[PDB]
Every structure is written in structure tokens, then in C-alpha cells.
Ligand binder design. Structure first.
Ligand SMILES: Nc1nc2c(ncn2[C@@H]2O[C@H](COP(=O)(O)OP(=O)(O)OP(=O)(O)O)[C@@H](O)[C@H]2O)c(=O)[nH]1
Ligand SMILES: Cc1cc2nc3c(=O)[nH]c(=O)nc-3n(C[C@H](O)[C@H](O)[C@H](O)COP(=O)(O)O)c2cc1C
Ligand SMILES: [Cl-]
Ligand SMILES: [Cl-]
Ligand SMILES: [Mg+2]
Length: 317
């Protein structure tokens, strides 16, 4: 099996365990075909491709196949971001884990300007079905990394900084969201899927939908919020272990850039607090049996690449 980025076809992978079956991977060709950015697609349901002339009866066949966890192939009109119409010969199929449970849906698009029939149709179907099988094999190697921790500790910024090299402005709390990265490890490409989650306690009942089949967890806390730090021990570590007793945990200290920041130190001082020190983070890591303690700053990117490199290594090496 190859890796996912080496499959030059239109396709996406969704996670049906999460609310509304969001896209967790999209190929470059798909993004090109549809004119969306990866940022606009991941974390969302693909229904946005549908439009005025889309046959809603055909859409129901898709919904029905998904609900029954079976494969289906149909042709329907879809639309690009700019409203450009195209015909979509679409194949969907479940990817199952060892215990035969559905883990993902794979979806393959073969685009054209017409509704193909007879021989052309038959050829089209055999083609996308073969592609689907290739994806299934490649997807078995997708590494699942789940990112948890208090609200506002910087889980999302960390993911955006790493995958886009930009830093976000406004703080927007997360429900669920997904990111992907292709990372060189020891000279070989690795596909890394990142599951962003909600820090707020009112999401305690939803959050664990992300947990099954997780390869490595990032438990995050802010180096300049001691409360987020103690919650590592009191909340996140127990929650993670409760669902995933054997999954490796990497402890991540965030906002490294603020630990030596004048104004931040002063504000903490006014609260009768001080920043979390490396030895303190290390000690927490040891206490919860984390395989690595790592500090980083989404803003400056210091220690950022190392976080995801080590995430992968905790799984593969
Ligand atoms: N100085 C500095 N500020 C950061 C850094 N990372 C995040 N922040 C700030 O902290 C705020 C919270 O960032 P988020 O990444 O959205 O926090 P989160 O953990 O994803 O929060 P929830 O989605 O609610 O669980 C951001 O708006 C930034 O202003 C960092 O590396 N350095
Ligand atoms: C793997 C995956 C790929 C999908 N690809 C498409 C697509 O190419 N075009 C499209 O119109 N819908 C696609 N969908 C179908 C929609 O996401 C959605 O399930 C369909 O609209 C029925 O859902 P709804 O009735 O709740 O909107 C895809 C779904 C999944 C599971
Ligand atoms: Cl903070
Ligand atoms: Cl820094
Ligand atoms: Mg967030």
C-alpha cells in the first residue's frame, strides 16, 4: 500500500463517528475539482457540492447507503465553489476496522460534463471502485492523533500554525474539527490525521466520539495557566485513559512564548501565580505516564514540528 498523497484521484475520507460525518481527508485533485481549500472542506459535511439541479432522489440513495453502512454508486449533478456545474460519477464505501466495525467512509468522484450510460457508465464504475480499494489499503496507514485539553490552551492555533504556517486572529471555541499533514519521518512519507476537540466541560458527552481507534493523544495545557495544568491530572488524563487504556499520551505545554513574556509574568504575578516550568511539566508527564513531554509555541512555531514528529514516532517506532 502507498500513502494517501500519492493517490492522484478525486476522493475524500469521512469519520461517521463524529456529528454529521465530517471530512477528515481530501485529496488535492478533489480540492482542484471543487475549487475549495483544504481548510474549507475538512471538518465539514460534503453536502455543499449539491445545488439547484441536483436530483434529490439520488442524494437520498447516498444518505440511505451511509445509514445502512453499505457501498453505493450513483451519478448526480454537483457544483464547484464558483457555481460551475459538473456531473459526478460517485462511489461510496465503508472502511471497516478489525472488529468489522465501520471506521470511515471513502468517497470517490469521477467528474464529467454528462450523465454517462451503458458501456461508458460500466467502465466508469469499475474505475472508481478500483480507486476506492487503493484508498482503503492506503488509509489503513493513516495515523490518528487526537488533541485534548482545556478551552483556550491553544489546541486549534497549534493545528493551524503547523498546517498553514499562519496564526489565527480571533479566538473561536471548537466543537470538532480536523486537520491533515504529510510528514517525512526517517525519509518516508506519513499521513497524519489530527482530531481537534472542545475544551469546554459542556462537551464532555460529545468529545469521546473522537476516541475509538486513536493512535496517539496530545494532552495540552498552557504554560501560563496553572489551572489548565492541574486539569491535566484531574480531568484529561483520567478521561483519556478511561476510554483508551493503552493509547500513548504526549503531554504538550503550549504558549511557550508567553512564559518569558513581561506582561504575562506580571499578570500571573497579580494572580499570585507563576508560569509552569519545564521540570514541572516533565514531572506531570512522568506522573501520568506520558511517553514524551514537549513544549512549543504556535505563534513562533518553536518546538512545533517536533510535537507532530514525536506524535508519529510514538506510534511507529
Ligand atoms: N502568545 C500565544 N498565544 C496563543 C498561542 N496559542 C494560542 N494562543 C491564544 O490563545 C487563544 C486560544 O487559542 P485556541 O487555539 O483557539 O484554544 P483552544 O484550545 O483550541 O480552545 P477550545 O477550542 O475552546 O478548546 C487564541 O485565541 C490565541 O489568542 C501561542 O502559541 N502563543
Ligand atoms: C465519503 C463521502 C463522500 C461524499 N461525496 C459527495 C460528493 O461527491 N457529492 C455529493 O453531492 N455528496 C457527497 N457526499 C454525500 C453527502 O455528504 C450527504 O451524505 C448526502 O447529501 C446525504 O446527506 P444529507 O441528506 O443529510 O444532506 C459524500 C458523503 C461521504 C460519506
Ligand atoms: Cl493561557
Ligand atoms: Cl518561543
Ligand atoms: Mg479549539
Amino acid at each position: 500500500a502507498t500513502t494517501l498523497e500519492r493517490i492522484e484521484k478525486n476522493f475524500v475520507i469521512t469519520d461517521p463517528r463524529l456529528p454529521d460525518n465530517p471530512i477528515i481527508f481530501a485529496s488535492d485533485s478533489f480540492l482542484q475539482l471543487t475549487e475549495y481549500s483544504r481548510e474549507e472542506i475538512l471538518g465539514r459535511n460534503m453536502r455543499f457540492l449539491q445545488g439547484p439541479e441536483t436530483d434529490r432522489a439520488t442524494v437520498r440513495k447516498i444518505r440511505d447507503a451511509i445509514d445502512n453502512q453499505t457501498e453505493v454508486t450513483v451519478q448526480l449533478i454537483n457544483y464547484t465553489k464558483s457555481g460551475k456545474k459538473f456531473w459526478n460519477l460517485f462511489h461510496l464505501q465503508p472502511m471497516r476496522d478489525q472488529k468489522g466495525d465501520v471506521q470511515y467512509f471513502i468517497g470517490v468522484q469521477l467528474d464529467g460534463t454528462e450523465h454517462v450510460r451503458d458501456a461508458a457508465e460500466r467502465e466508469g464504475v469499475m474505475l472508481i471502485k478500483k480507486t476506492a480499494e487503493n484508498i482503503d489499503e492506503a488509509a489503513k496507514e493513516l495515523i490518528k492523533c487526537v488533541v485534548v485539553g482545556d478551552g483556550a490552551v491553544g489546541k486549534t492555533c497549534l493545528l493551524i500554525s503547523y498546517t498553514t504556517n499562519a496564526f489565527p486572529g480571533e479566538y473561536i471555541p471548537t466543537v470538532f474539527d480536523n486537520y491533515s499533514a504529510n510528514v517525512m519521518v526517517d525519509g518516508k512519507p506519513v499521513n497524519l490525521g489530527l482530531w481537534d476537540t472542545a475544551g469546554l466541560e459542556d462537551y464532555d458527552r460529545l468529545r469521546p466520539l473522537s476516541y475509538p481507534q486513536t493512535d496517539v493523544f496530545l494532552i495540552c495545557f498552557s504554560l501560563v495557566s496553572p489551572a489548565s495544568f492541574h486539569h491535566v491530572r484531574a480531568k484529561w488524563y483520567p478521561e483519556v485513559r478511561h476510554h483508551c487504556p493503552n493509547t500513548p499520551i504526549i503531554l504538550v505545554g503550549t504558549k511557550l512564548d508567553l512564559r518569558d513574556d513581561k506582561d504575562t509574568i506580571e499578570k500571573l504575578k497579580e494572580k499570585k501565580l507563576t508560569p509552569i516550568t519545564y521540570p514541572q511539566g516533565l514531572a506531570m508527564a512522568k506522573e501520568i505516564g506520558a511517553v514524551k513531554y514537549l513544549e512549543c509555541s504556535a505563534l513562533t512555531q518553536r518546538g512545533l514540528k517536533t510535537v507532530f514528529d514525536e506524535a508519529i514516532r510514538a506510534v511507529l517506532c
